[PDB]
Amino acid sequence: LPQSFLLKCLEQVRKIQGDGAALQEKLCATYKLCHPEELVLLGHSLGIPWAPLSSCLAGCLSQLHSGLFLYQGLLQALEGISPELGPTLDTLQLDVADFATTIWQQMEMPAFASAFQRRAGGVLVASHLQSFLEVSYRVLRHLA
Amino acid sequence: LPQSFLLKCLEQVRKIQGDGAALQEKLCATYKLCHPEELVLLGHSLGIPWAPLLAGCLSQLHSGLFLYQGLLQALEGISPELGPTLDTLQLDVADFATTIWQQMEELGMMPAFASAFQRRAGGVLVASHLQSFLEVSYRVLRHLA
Amino acid sequence: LPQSFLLKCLEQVRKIQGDGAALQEKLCATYKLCHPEELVLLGHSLGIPWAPLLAGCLSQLHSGLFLYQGLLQALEGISPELGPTLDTLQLDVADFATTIWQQMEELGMMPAFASAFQRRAGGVLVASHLQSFLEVSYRVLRHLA
Numbered sequence A: 001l002p003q004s005f006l007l008k009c010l011e012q013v014r015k016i017q018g019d020g021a022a023l024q025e026k027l028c029a030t031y032k033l034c035h036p037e038e039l040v041l042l043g044h045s046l047g048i049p050w051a052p053l054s055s056c057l058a059g060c061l062s063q064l065h066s067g068l069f070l071y072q073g074l075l076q077a078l079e080g081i082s083p084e085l086g087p088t089l090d091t092l093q094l095d096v097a098d099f100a101t102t103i104w105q106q107m108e109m110p111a112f113a114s115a116f117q118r119r120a121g122g123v124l125v126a127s128h129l130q131s132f133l134e135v136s137y138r139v140l141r142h143l144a
Numbered sequence B, C: 001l002p003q004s005f006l007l008k009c010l011e012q013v014r015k016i017q018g019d020g021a022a023l024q025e026k027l028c029a030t031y032k033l034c035h036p037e038e039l040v041l042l043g044h045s046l047g048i049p050w051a052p053l054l055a056g057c058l059s060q061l062h063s064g065l066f067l068y069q070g071l072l073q074a075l076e077g078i079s080p081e082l083g084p085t086l087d088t089l090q091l092d093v094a095d096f097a098t099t100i101w102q103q104m105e106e107l108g109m110m111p112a113f114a115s116a117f118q119r120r121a122g123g124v125l126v127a128s129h130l131q132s133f134l135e136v137s138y139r140v141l142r143h144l145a
Helices: A003-031 A058-077 A086-107 A115-142 B003-031 B036-045 B056-074 B083-106 B116-143 C003-030 C036-045 C055-074 C083-106 C116-144
Strands: none
Touching (some): A003 A086, A003 B056, A003 B083, A058 A086, A058 A115, B003 B083, B036 B116, B056 B083, B056 B116, B083 B116, C003 C083, C055 C116
């Protein structure tokens, strides 16, 4: 796709990543939930879906788009995790929502039932979105 | 680490130092902002975060790179001439950082630049910090080999 | 020494180091020769010369580059595959030799790699030393202006 497009995608993945790192930094400072690693088995229980992209033009781009559409959903489902994290979460959601539209333009949920469920769901969705955007850049770089 | 990943990195360090030195030489040439020591007090005024420098160290390179990707995007092209110079330096930083990220997987592990003078001077100081950052990164990669 | 010339030198220095680095990682990854130190015996046995390092030093750097064009040529492309990569490295060292010389002007100032294992392992050894020769030219030009 054009280089202008790929650089547009980078600016965006990097903004969404700086937001995700602000979230992750709050969840660690405020709840000591600092190691996504430790929560890996809870993602089961929490029933967090996975967006596949590594083994993936338009079909791939559609997959990125779906995966983004999935993360704006999950973020929404987290209902802001706590009053103090609410702002942070809104910023990351408006941002994932933008990247989702750059992709379509170019084409042209769980129940986190508790304080603990919202927090651990928070850490894991922030971590799964990081990895996914790291994979979306490598995939787009391979399509430019 | 695998010596071949190490050799792929030592290559990407130099390819970024090249683009960096190219930006610096163009800024000096087109605008006469030739000495980062004349703009250092101003690095403080432009709110620039200097980035410090297995798992933890590979993570500090990756964080450093991630900061440096921020600062470069914030200069928004600097000027119509320097535009493509900056576009190559971002795609190269972004590729190096992806390389550190993919290997940490396998192993299992802002300033705003208000005016044209701020974008110009900003380009001088960040090309300049990224240069040293990367040298020290060429030294600790040797060491974590 | 004019700060502009000196930043054109840094970009040339990083350019040749990146080509150096390009060759190393291809030799390490095509023929698993990933360590100069495991070849210091072959190198001693070939008796290969390494170059030492305003007028005087500027002239030492110029003659140092001359030596490395010499050594790079003797490798006779290493393999068909590695051909282009060495041509670039030759040409980029040539550029930089010229630049240095031109500065001198406006201021008024081979072993035989008899074998195929020898070309590949002599590739690893020259690229590695060149890399180190150029970092010090990077520091001497740094302290020169």
